[PDB]
Amino acid sequence: DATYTWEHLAWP
Amino acid sequence: GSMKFVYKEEHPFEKRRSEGEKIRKKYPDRVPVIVEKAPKARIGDLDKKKYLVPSDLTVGQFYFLIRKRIHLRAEDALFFFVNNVIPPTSATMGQLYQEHHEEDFFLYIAYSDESVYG
Ligand SMILES: [Cl-]
Ligand SMILES: [Cl-]
Ligand SMILES: [Cl-]
Ligand SMILES: [Cl-]
Ligand code: NA
């Protein structure tokens, strides 16, 4: 998998 | 249901279903998840329950991100439970969502440090 951060998990 | 999810107690079904359906249409490469700590797990609690996560995110990377977020030690245990089964670290969120999402269009994940939880 690509690199993700906590912010990529945010409810929009 | 790997837990009694507080999210379900606090939001009525049709509101959940309408939101989960809408979000799946709007963000087809992400999946809507509810993540809650097992009630008697003596570990950090997350601030938010509701997340929208990349479909290609693996469980193992989610564990890493949670560790960084709540300062759960690299040496300590951390498990997800989806319908009381611990997903492999290589499983993706999209795969788990496809197999296990509820009728409200959300995937529900419990976490704990206890391997034998449930
Ligand atoms: Cl998307
Ligand atoms: Cl948090
Ligand atoms: Cl929330
Ligand atoms: Cl892995
Ligand atoms: Na919480």
Side-chain angles (χ1 to χ4, degrees), chain A, chain B residues 1-3 5-21 23-24 26-98 100-118:
Chain A
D1 47 340
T3 300
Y4 292 117
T5 68
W6 194 253
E7 289 70 31
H8 294 266
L9 313 180
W11 195 256
Chain B
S2 43
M3 225 192 98
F5 288 88
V6 176
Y7 194 82
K8 297 182 189 186
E9 294 184 339
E10 294 185 346
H11 303 87
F13 173 85
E14 174 53 22
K15 285 283 111 281
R16 301 194 309 259
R17 188 208 64 76
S18 186
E19 179 174 65
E21 182 174 43
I23 285 296
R24 279 293 295 143
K26 193 165 179 60
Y27 303 95
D29 298 315
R30 301 181 217 188
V31 292
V33 192
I34 302 304
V35 178
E36 291 187 34
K37 185 185 71 65
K40 296 177 194 176
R42 299 95 188 273
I43 67 179
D45 214 331
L46 294 167
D47 284 340
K48 301 189 91 205
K49 297 175 176 55
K50 178 165 71 174
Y51 300 89
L52 182 65
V53 308
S55 299
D56 64 0
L57 174 68
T58 62
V59 167
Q61 191 173 191
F62 208 159
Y63 287 161
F64 182 83
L65 294 173
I66 291 170
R67 282 195 171 82
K68 175 180 285 202
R69 180 74 183 188
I70 67 175
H71 317 291
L72 190 148
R73 297 190 307 174
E75 73 199 85
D76 284 340
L78 175 60
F79 303 93
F80 281 173
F81 302 85
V82 178
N83 295 326
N84 291 122
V85 179
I86 302 161
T89 55
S90 57
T92 70
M93 298 284 111
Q95 289 155 19
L96 294 174
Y97 182 93
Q98 180 178 63
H100 305 295
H101 74 80
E102 300 275 30
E103 300 279 11
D104 65 3
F105 296 84
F106 283 84
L107 170 69
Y108 287 82
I109 301 182
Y111 71 94
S112 181
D113 64 324
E114 193 192 17
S115 76
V116 301
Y117 169 74

